[PDB]
Amino acid sequence: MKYGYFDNDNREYVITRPDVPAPWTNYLGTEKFCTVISHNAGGYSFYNSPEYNRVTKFRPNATFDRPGHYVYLRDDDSGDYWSISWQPVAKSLDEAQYQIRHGLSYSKFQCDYNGIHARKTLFVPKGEDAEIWDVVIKNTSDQVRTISAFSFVEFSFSHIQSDNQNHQMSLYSAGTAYRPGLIEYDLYYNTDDFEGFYYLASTFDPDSYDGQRDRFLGLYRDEANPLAVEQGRCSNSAQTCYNHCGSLHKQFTLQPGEEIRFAYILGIGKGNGERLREHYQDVANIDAAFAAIKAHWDERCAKFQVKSPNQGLDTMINAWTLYQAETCVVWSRFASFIEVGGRTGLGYRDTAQDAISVPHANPEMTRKRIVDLLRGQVKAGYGLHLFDPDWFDPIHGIKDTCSDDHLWLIPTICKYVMETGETSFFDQMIPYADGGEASVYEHMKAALDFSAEYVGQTGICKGLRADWNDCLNLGGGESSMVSFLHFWALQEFIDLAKFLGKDQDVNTYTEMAANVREACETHLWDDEGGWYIRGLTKNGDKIGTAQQQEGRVHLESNTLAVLSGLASQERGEQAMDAVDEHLFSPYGLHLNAPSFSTPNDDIGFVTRVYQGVKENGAIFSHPNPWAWVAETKLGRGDRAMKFYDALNPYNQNDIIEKRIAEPYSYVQFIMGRDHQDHGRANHPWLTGTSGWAYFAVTNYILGVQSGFTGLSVDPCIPSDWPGFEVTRQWRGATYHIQVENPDHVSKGVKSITLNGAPIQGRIPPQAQGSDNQVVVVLG
Amino acid sequence: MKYGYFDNDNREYVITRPDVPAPWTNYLGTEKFCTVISHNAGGYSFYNSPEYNRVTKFRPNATFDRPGHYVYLRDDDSGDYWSISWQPVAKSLDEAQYQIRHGLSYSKFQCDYNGIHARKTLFVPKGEDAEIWDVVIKNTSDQVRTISAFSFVEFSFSHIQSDNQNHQMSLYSAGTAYRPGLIEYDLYYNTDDFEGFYYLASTFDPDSYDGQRDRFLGLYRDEANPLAVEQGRCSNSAQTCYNHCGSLHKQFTLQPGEEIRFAYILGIGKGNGERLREHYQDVANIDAAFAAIKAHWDERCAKFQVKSPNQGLDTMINAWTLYQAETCVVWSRFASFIEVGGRTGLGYRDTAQDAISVPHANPEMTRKRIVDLLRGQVKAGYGLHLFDPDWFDPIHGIKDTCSDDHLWLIPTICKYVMETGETSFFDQMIPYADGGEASVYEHMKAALDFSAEYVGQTGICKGLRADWNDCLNLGGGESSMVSFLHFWALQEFIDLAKFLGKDQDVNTYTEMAANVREACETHLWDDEGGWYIRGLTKNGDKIGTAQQQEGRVHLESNTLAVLSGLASQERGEQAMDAVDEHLFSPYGLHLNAPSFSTPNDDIGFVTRVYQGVKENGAIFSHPNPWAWVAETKLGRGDRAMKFYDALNPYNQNDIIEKRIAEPYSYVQFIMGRDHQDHGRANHPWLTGTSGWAYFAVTNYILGVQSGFTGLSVDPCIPSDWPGFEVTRQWRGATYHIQVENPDHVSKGVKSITLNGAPIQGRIPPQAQGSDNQVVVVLG
């Protein structure tokens, strides 16, 4: 069963029926003002901080996703009314036809009902901290129709906690005032003229308005049947205290076939409302703004485009996965329909990993996040697990420290410089979160030295509070995953030092890496099962062995052993074969197996989690891409693609009854085989799976990698692929790559020609604006 | 306009029409399990801690109060359905007749609709941590009817924050399982067999059930139209993860005039559900449980009953205000429809004051709270503003310290001992919150000495973080209110030391009191306006003078100057006359006037609050009773009663269109004259106004006061009262007091006879179980 389809031509996902089993959301905004909106227009907006600057309210985890950004239409001749989005009015689907087009940074809502065609495009224009609601109403009947339009948003008290509780204070913390076509919402306790004011304006001159939620909705009514909409007029309410809303009403008389256009604007700051409502009265300004949003993503998408035998891969890499990955880098991980309060700011390991995915498309935001992370690192070398970057924009103890956080930053920084060529970045001085400063280069060394110090007697990195798996708390225990990550980070750093001619560091860290490898190969391999263990308890008991009854095979350790380059080809293939045989499912790779069923605090909280859920036996998406990378390094392209196809949301477009979540977005986890809902996907959008999936496909399957001295092309694809093509923009130059596979192998470059001339190895960075033809023949 | 009436005979408030402009709530429970339920059955339950042990969910501050404890009835012949409570189904009020009877610790819901009579009584039985839903369905039509009943509650994830956010965790933190007539809800991460399990059981053997909210309610539906109820059967869902509910269904066939009875039980702990569903199958056990709830309050009400010319006073004092005051003492201030998360435990000054109100009715809980407060006090002498008593059941700095908190405890402890006679209490050793211990007596001295130390150069108590008025932050500034409170506390302590023969303390504190009085009379009186100022800024500027444009007259300072006994009769009358002339309104006394309009941080946050709202110019209820006490001390009974009648909710039973809130409950504040909603009452139930109102009327207007050596009767009533009668239970003996006012004076005792014998002054405590006739003649 499906509810829509991918429109490759317009780069939109079209939802043909609104009764989806869950809200399918999209993100509006590319700067500071953001909106998480569903296909039913449910959702909310916030400015910069979702926790402290929420703009409109949201009642989460309920059967309906309300409130939202709604437009109610009413036939003033009959009194009949409906919303442009299906919900909240929910007009019968046998009577009204609804369509939703989720695009990159914009969503189009359409409704055709009883002779009236209506469209509403919600998008946050660049350069403004506001959301435009571009509305078009057309009379498609053969008679004169009189239609009234009503807007609605419930203004937030700005602090999420103030919306959820402490109403003894928040109910008297704001007020509304009205001026022609503008409802001004004042957060009375926020003296800032910008941040302390929100508004809902209309390009038309209103017939009526409502600033009080209780008056617009009415007694014992809700968003589904507002009193104002039912009676055909607002009550012109505006006062201080209680709950406020932004409702502007206008009646229109439409001749047969006639159409009108106007806009509503939800925004922040005094003065802006009056300005923008006037600015957008000229619809050409709305079109220009929308055109800038299209350009924004056209520019980004064009920097890496692929044409291959796999339509699913092409569709996702060329738009959707890039979009999801950059959304994570820009908006972080704490504003969705699942993350709705509490945690805010940046998760260290989350953004550290996300930032490695799109430096080719958004180098500026990537650099900004990397700098945030560097500022969020302490002298000791570890990172603050969760912090607000604004705190350090010109501290927890070792007990709350997570052992992997800081290590992910290393490969990410190296990638950023490789991509942009900003080698001077390594010399920039950045202050530590706990005082003092050091160069970016020294920040990196502080991180690597920390992991070398915090190891067990066997030489394996301590899990501390928790490693990648938040539910793996070994403290004094040891994590295979961290040691493998450390090796990967070291290999990346060695190449850097080598490139910078830092001979001493090359020796130091090459030696450090040597010790990590020997320690891992000596203690972490289980030669009975043929794979790498997950780690060891603080008491020295190995976790993840062939003899245990629970949690024998682990995805993170086995995939990272290969991805990091630590494991030999032999152990790599066998470990990954164990992953395929025991963890693979049509929905993706399980995190471990069998699931844990006996609580054991020596292993961690994972033993106290439901089987097939979250970290305990579920298909945790994040690590799946590591498996793809591992397979490319082993030269098994067919295996890699089998893993990719199984997790690719695109291929599950017609099994929504089982998946439930968005077919255009990766999710945090899918219920594993041990849970009765096996197959149901949970938490779309803000998951590092997107950044990693993008990175894995572009850099390892398609094999295009930017480097300190050149561009590398070394693919690992399915043996039956005749070839593929990629357009890659790197450092201001374009590389038109064509890969040919006449002998039908999976990996191995026979030859590479640059502009008709044969070359050996890396493609040297070409002149600015140059277009280069690169032919790669596998063999 | 009214929506109900007081039923004095049954001690219930009868709501005749459910479309009240706001939820009118009641509290179920007297021990640890509590339920805040509305007249529409909306609301939630919690066990001990509302913040960490919520049992069922609540979506606050919305147009509907959901979810709740609902019972849906369905006619299986027509498919028609409705709820016993009006909402959530909301059957037309032209078709169904609804009635709600809120009683003391129980609520009765009734619905008569299309030939079916249904009743549902919700109450928490003593001895169990559960809520009983006693349901009776009667076929009042002339034909055989087939009716199905469905229950519904949405189980909470226990931590309020987990219900409001962090669903990435909470959505996989619980599960449901089913056993005959019992839905078992397991909080998977809470290993305690009692606290980590909830349940919804039924005395009948179910035809179907639902443990999954999404299955019972269905897609794109809510509590108003559950899929299960509409189709006439549950889906028998039960699993781990997602949102859970407790729905048990049973179909009944009823002959004309036939009625059936059964019960649903919402509770906590494994094993209890199976036990109670079986126990209550014998309806006689439900009746016995209900009878225990009636007895519980009959016993308490009988300890103080009044018969006077004022029906409003009688109705409230004899039941409702006692009920509200004890509810505050037992359940604290953080569980209502307004307080729904964040703050939890005990507010120092709040409970310190509440505990002075009902020691005659619930001495055990009073003692418990006093001990909690003593444990919550630090060696320095001040109290922790907000703390959880469980923390200290066998610490903030001076910056977060509120200057009045600890002082309120003094009069309260003295009253407790006067009331119970437990003089040994003063010797009990209690540990300080920050280490060490001392006798109750020394805890008290530590409090008094703190206020003597923290004063300005003029000798007035520093406001510190804030005094009684949380929005009055003077820090180094000085508060008139605190100095007056200090004097009152000192006078109480002096009488105690005198009674205990602690001569040295008598001298010490009598001297301390002397200095406070001289300092107050010298610096706080404004002889131009004729009243006491509110205080002084840190820079020495007086606040509350006749020459200022804003905040000239303040209620707290002027009422406390008299209540404390500090002010002379002359200044007392004039100050209170200023209060009457400038602060009185038909709705009660404003906190100050004129309202502040210019922000000034030297005065406090009150200058940043909307005019006529909260602390800035609103009718803040709490201080009103102090005005009544002040007037009785001035001997102006008519003035006192004018103030009482204006604030008494009872007298506003027919102006709900303006008041909005419960006519049987005091509220935190009523919008003042400066706000357009002047008259609207906000935050019923959990306000110290109830405890103070009860204390003021019983002890000062009716003038009955327990003492260390005797019972005092010295009333101050309206001059036109011919007299009144009071039944007072004190220390195991009963005092039948009859007050006669033949000369029609307001205050002044001509004579008092005890059992026919004339006496002078205090009535010595009589023998246990004795009944004494006390005739007081005013003159």
Ligand SMILES: CC(=O)N[C@@H]1[C@@H](O)[C@H](O)[C@@H](CO)O[C@@H]1O
């Ligand atoms: C105007 C306003 O919101 N005042 C409230 C006050 O009533 C409440 O007691 C306190 C609790 O922390 O918070 C705020 O100061």
Ligand SMILES: CC(=O)N[C@@H]1[C@@H](O)[C@H](O)[C@@H](CO)O[C@@H]1O
């Ligand atoms: C099973 C479970 O609830 N795990 C979550 C983990 O996924 C999440 O990253 C972390 C954030 O603090 O909280 C919990 O550990």
Ligand SMILES: CC(=O)N[C@@H]1[C@@H](O)[C@H](O)[C@@H](CO)O[C@H]1O
């Ligand atoms: C936002 C956040 O804290 N995400 C965490 C991620 O950091 C962690 O690596 C992973 C595995 O436990 O689980 C996610 O929920």
Ligand SMILES: CC(=O)N[C@@H]1[C@@H](O)[C@H](O)[C@@H](CO)O[C@H]1O
């Ligand atoms: C529960 C609570 O903190 N209640 C406070 C009370 O202590 C304070 O004395 C009064 C005046 O400001 O305002 C109430 O809101």
Ligand SMILES: [Ca+2]
């Ligand atoms: Ca403001």
Ligand SMILES: [Ca+2]
């Ligand atoms: Ca070019």
Ligand SMILES: [Ca+2]
């Ligand atoms: Ca449990």
Ligand SMILES: [Ca+2]
């Ligand atoms: Ca007796």
